[PDB]
Design a protein around this nucleic acid. Sequence first.
RNA 1: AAAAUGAAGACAUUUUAACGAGUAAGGAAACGAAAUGGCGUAAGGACAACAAAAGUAGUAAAGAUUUAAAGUAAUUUAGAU
RNA 2: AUAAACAUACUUUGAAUCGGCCAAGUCUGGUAAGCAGGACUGGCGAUGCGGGAUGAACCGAACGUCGAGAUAAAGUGCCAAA
RNA 3: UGUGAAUUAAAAGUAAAAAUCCGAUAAUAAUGGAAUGAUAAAAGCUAUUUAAGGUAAGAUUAAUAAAUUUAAUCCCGAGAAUAGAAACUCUUGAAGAAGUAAAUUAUCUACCCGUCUUGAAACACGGACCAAGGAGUCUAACAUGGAUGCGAAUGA
Lengths: 96, 173, 210, 129, 165, 167
Amino acid sequence: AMVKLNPYAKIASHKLAQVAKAQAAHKAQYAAKMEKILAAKKEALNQSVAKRFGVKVENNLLKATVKRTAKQDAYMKKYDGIVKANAKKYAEKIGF
Amino acid sequence: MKEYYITARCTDKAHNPNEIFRSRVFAPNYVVAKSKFWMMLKKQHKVKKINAELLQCQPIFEKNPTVVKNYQIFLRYVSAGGIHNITKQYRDVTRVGAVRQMYNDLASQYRTRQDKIQLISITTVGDKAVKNPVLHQFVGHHVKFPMVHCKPVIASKRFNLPIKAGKLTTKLC
Amino acid sequence: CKARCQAFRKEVILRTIKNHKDIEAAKKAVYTAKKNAEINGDLYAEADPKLIVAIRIRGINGVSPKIKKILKLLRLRQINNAVFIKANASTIKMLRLVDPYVTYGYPTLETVQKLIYKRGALKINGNRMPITSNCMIKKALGDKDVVCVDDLVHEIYTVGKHFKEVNNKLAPFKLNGAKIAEKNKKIHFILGGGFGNRELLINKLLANMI
Amino acid sequence: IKPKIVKKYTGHFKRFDSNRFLRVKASWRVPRGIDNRLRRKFKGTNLLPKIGYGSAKATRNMLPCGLYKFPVRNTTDLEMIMMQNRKYAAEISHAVSAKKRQEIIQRAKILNIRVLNADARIKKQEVAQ
Amino acid sequence: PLSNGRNRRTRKLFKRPFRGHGLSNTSTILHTYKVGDYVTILCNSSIQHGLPYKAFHGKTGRVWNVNPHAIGVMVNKKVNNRIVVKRLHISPEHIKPSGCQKDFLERKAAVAAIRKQNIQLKKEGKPLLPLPAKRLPKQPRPAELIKGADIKFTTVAPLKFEELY
Amino acid sequence: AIDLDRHHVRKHVSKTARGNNAYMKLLVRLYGFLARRTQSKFAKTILHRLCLSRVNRPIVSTSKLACLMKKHPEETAVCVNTVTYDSRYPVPKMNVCALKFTKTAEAAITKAGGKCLRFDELALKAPTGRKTVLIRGKRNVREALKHFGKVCAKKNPAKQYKGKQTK
RNA sequence: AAAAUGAAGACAUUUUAACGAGUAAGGAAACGAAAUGGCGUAAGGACAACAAAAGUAGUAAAGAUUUAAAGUAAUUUAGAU
RNA sequence: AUAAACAUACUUUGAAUCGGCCAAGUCUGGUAAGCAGGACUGGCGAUGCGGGAUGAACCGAACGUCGAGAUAAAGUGCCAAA
RNA sequence: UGUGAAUUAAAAGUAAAAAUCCGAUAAUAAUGGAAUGAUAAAAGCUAUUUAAGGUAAGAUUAAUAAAUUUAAUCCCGAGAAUAGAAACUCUUGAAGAAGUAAAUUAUCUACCCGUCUUGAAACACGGACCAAGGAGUCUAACAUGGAUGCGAAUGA
C-alpha cells in the first residue's frame, strides 16, 4: 500500500539501505582504529607505571598510529584553537 | 529539573528593540521555562508575549558533574502570614541536582508547594561558609561514621521472595 | 487504455522530488543563518510556527455555550480528535478560550506524515472515505493542484496557498488513548497538567496516540 | 455447505417480576414505570430486547440443519419447493392425519425433499413389532 | 423591583456629559443625512420633545426617509426568539453620523484609485498594477537577525521581597 | 460520544408517486430511469414534480396556456397537473402535455387544432426536453390560505372561520 | 443520506459513509426503491390439490399439560400425553 | 479568519408543560439555617456507567449486541485488579 | 610535606568503538505471541538489460575546513522491457463431537412494584393468592392533512 500511495518509497528505501550499510562500515573501521589507539595507550601505561619501581615520568610514551600529512597536522592545531575559543565564548555568555 | 538559558526582546513603542532580557530558569521542561520567563518580564517590565520576540532557549548542562560542591540558594516564599526570604545551603554535584533538593525540602519542612517559591539566585560557597547545623558536620576532611541497622540489599526484584526460610538478620554492614 | 497510469505515476514522482526539495532547502537555510549568526556574534530569532495541531481532551458534557460553538468551528466535536489549525491572531485567541478542553502544539513533519498516512481521510460526496489511492485524491482536490498524498502532506506542512480548501477536505483524525498528563487533565501543562499549549512536546503525546 | 449461525444471546428475555408473581407471565413487556429498576438500566438488571441482538441477515430463520421451514398440508404443497430442496425443508402441519402423512413422506423422498416430522404420528410399531 | 415608566432608570443614562450641558453644536442640525446612511441614536435629554425610547440609545441604524424636520431611522430590535424591524422618526438632535464604515470606505477608495490607473495602463499597453492585499490577522513574524554591535543585555531574576511599610 | 448539531432524520422530500395508482407509479419509474441515465435537469424536474401531493399540484387552465404559449408558437407546454377549461376565453392551437385533461378542455384543444399528449408520448418525442415550456399553476389562490394566521393581527389579518353568530 | 440497479429475485434489492441514552409527547392505513416495521383476539367477503372431486379433519378437530426449534421481542412452529 | 448542502428558509396541524430542585473564585433579607428570593452557566428532573465505602445533583464520561487494545477520574499493605 | 576546584605545555587525536550518567527521542526493523479473518494471483518479491537518481550520509581521492563546500571516477541503481516460483499436516467425535437446555455448586452482580412528587427501597398510599370481566366509544357541526373522482363546476 505504501508503494501504491507513495511511488517514491522505492527510491527512498534504496538510499536508506545505502546509508544503513555505509554507516555500518564506517563504525567498523572507527572501532578498528580506536582499538589500536587504546592499544597504544595500554602499552604507554604499563611502561610508565615503573614509577612504582625504584620519580618523574617521560613525556611522549604515547605513540602515533595514524600517519598524516603536515598540512593536516597544522589544521589539527588550528581546529583545536577554535574549540577552546568557542568553549570560552559560550561559557562567558552564561556566566552573566 | 533542568536549567535553561532564555533570551528575548521587546518590540513596541515603550521599549527600544536593542535591550535583551536574559535569564537562567530551572524548569522541568522548556515550555515551563518560557512560562516562568514571560511572567518575570510581565511582572517587572510590562513586556507581554504578544509584543515580544524570543531569541534563544537552550539547555545548560553541568560542566563537571563529578565534583562535590556546596550551594547557597537565596529564595522567597509565601506563607499563611506573609512573604519571607530564606537562604538554604545544599551539597550536590549539579546545580539542577541541588534545586530539586530545595523544592522537596521546602515542601516538607515548610509544607510549601512549588507555586509559592521564587528562586532569586544560586551560588557556590566555601567549605567553612556552610551554616546548616546538620550539613556542617560532613564538610570536614575527616568525616567518618558506621552505618548501623543496615537492611540487607537485594540485587533486584528477581530474588524478592514474599516468604523466606530461616531467620532474618540486619547488618552492622 | 491504461497508458495514462504510467503517466500519472511519473507525475507523482516529479512532484515528490519538487516537494522534498522545498522542505529540505528551507530547512537548510535556517541552519546556515544560525551558523553565520554565531560566527558574527549576532542574534538569530527563529520564525514563529505557522501550523498548529489541536486535540480534544474533554468530553461533550458540561460545556459553556460559547466554548461549545468554538469547538464546533474547529471541528473538534469528539474527544480524542485532532485537526490542523492555521496560526494567526484570530485562531490563537480562540484556542486560549477553549484551553481547558484542548491541548495543542506545533507538529513536526514526521508527525504530519504519520497522521495523514495512518489516520487520514477525505470528505467526498458527504462520505468520510479513508485515503486509499492517489486517484481518490486527484478527484477530490484536482482543482486545487493537489494530486498525490505527498502533495497533500507538503501543502499542510508548509501552509500553502490552498491550505483552507485542502484542510477542510481532510476529516478530523480519530486518535487512540494515551497518558494525557503527569498530574491530571484538570490543570495546564505548565503546572504539570494535561491541557494547554504544549509547544513542540505535542509530538511525544501524538506518538503514543497515533 | 453451511455457514456458521451465530446467536448473540441464547437466553430468554423474561418479563420483569415474572419470577415473583404467578399473575405476571414470562412474555416480555417493556416496563413503563416511572421508578422501574429495569427500564432505568440499573447495574444487575439491565437486560432488555434491542435491535442490536438481531442475528445475521444471511443466517436468520435458518434451522440448525442448515435449511429453512416450509409447511405442507398435502402432496401438492411439496411441488413448490422441489426446485429448492437445497434451501427448504418440508414440515407437515400438526393437524394432518397419519394416512395423509405417509403420502407426503413417501412423495418427499421421491422429490428428495427433507421432512422434519419424519417420525410424527407414527403407528404403535415400537413394541412387539 | 422597578416601575414600568417610560423613562425608568435614567439617572445616569440621561445625564448630560460632565461640562457638556447647554446647547449642542451647530453641526448637528447642519449635517446632511441621505437615505442609506448609517446613524447612531443618542437620546439628548436636553430636548424632551420627541425623545427616542431609552432602549434605542447607542444602537446603530440606517436612514430610510428624510422628512422636513425629522430623519427616519431603521434599527433592529430583539424579541422573544426573533428580530423585528423598527422604523422611527427622529429629529437630528438625537441622532449622530456613524463611523461604522469609515475603514471600509478607505479600502473602497484605494481600490478605485488603482482601478483608475489600470484602464490607463491597459490603454497604453503597460502591465497593470495589482489591487491591494486583503486584510489578514496578525501573522507569525518571520525569521529576523539582530546585529551584535548595538545590543545591551539586562539580567532578569525574581526580585527579593521588600516590605511596603 | 459526538457533539452534533442535530441527529439524522428522514429528509422531507418525496421520491416516489404517492398512492397506489399503477400508472403514476409507472411514470415515476420511466422518469426515474431517464433522470438517472440521461442526467438531464428536465427529467429531474418532471420526476420531482410527479411526486408532489395533489394539493401541491395545482391546475392550469387553457387561458394560462394560451397566454404563456403566445410567443412560443412551435412549442409544447408541459404541466404536471390537471388542465381545466376556461370557458370565458378562446383556446388557440397548441400541443399540451399534462397528467389529465378535462373533458371540456380536451375537446377545446382538439377542435382548435392542438394535441393533448400524455407524459409517455412526451418522453417518446422530447425525452430530454427540447421544445418544452415548463408550466405550473398558482398555489396561493387556495381558499385555505386566507384563514391561516391570527385574525387579530395588525398587518396581515386572517379570515376568521365562520361559525356561531358570525356577523 | 447519496450513488447503482430494478417486473418480481428476496432477506424490504447492492455499495459506501455517518449515526444508535431518555420521562411527558409524537410518529393512523396505503405509497419499488415504499412519508417507521411488525405480533396477537374475534367476526364478514374472497383465495387455498388448476387435468372434472381442488385447505386440514374418527388413520383423530378445537382445547389442556409439557419437550424442542425459529424470532431482538411481541409471538409462531412441531413432537408426546 | 473559521465553520456550514441530510446547508439554509420555512409553512401547516397539533401534543405535553409552565409545583421545580442543585452547584458556584455570585448577590439581597436574616444571628444563622439542608431558610427565603434573584443575575449567568452547567446539571438533576428525563440518566444509566467507572470513582468518591454508602449518596438525584460532586469527578470522569453520557448507553445498539460483542472481541481485542491503549486510556479518564482516581488508585497500587489485605478486603481489591494494580 | 601531601590532596587539590580551575588553568596551562608537550605526545596522541579527522575528532562516529564500548559502558554509565546527562540530554534526545520513540519508531523503521528482527524474533516470539494475542483478537478477528483470507488463501489466489499480484502496481508482489527475485533474476537479466539501459540508466532518472544517491542534496551532510553509497565509497575513495584532491583543493581546503569550526562546510548539509567544490570537483573527478567508481559502485548501487527507481521507471520500463524480458523471464520466476504456493497448494499442506496431526488429534478427537453415533462407545455421542461442537453447540443448547434444565438442576446444583463457586466468583462477580442484584433494595418493592404501580403512583403523585424537586426528590421513594422508603417509617408515603393500593397490593394475601388465582381465574374470568374491566376503562378514549357512538352520534352531530367545523377545520387541517394524506389517498380518490369530477372540474366552473361538484353532489343530487
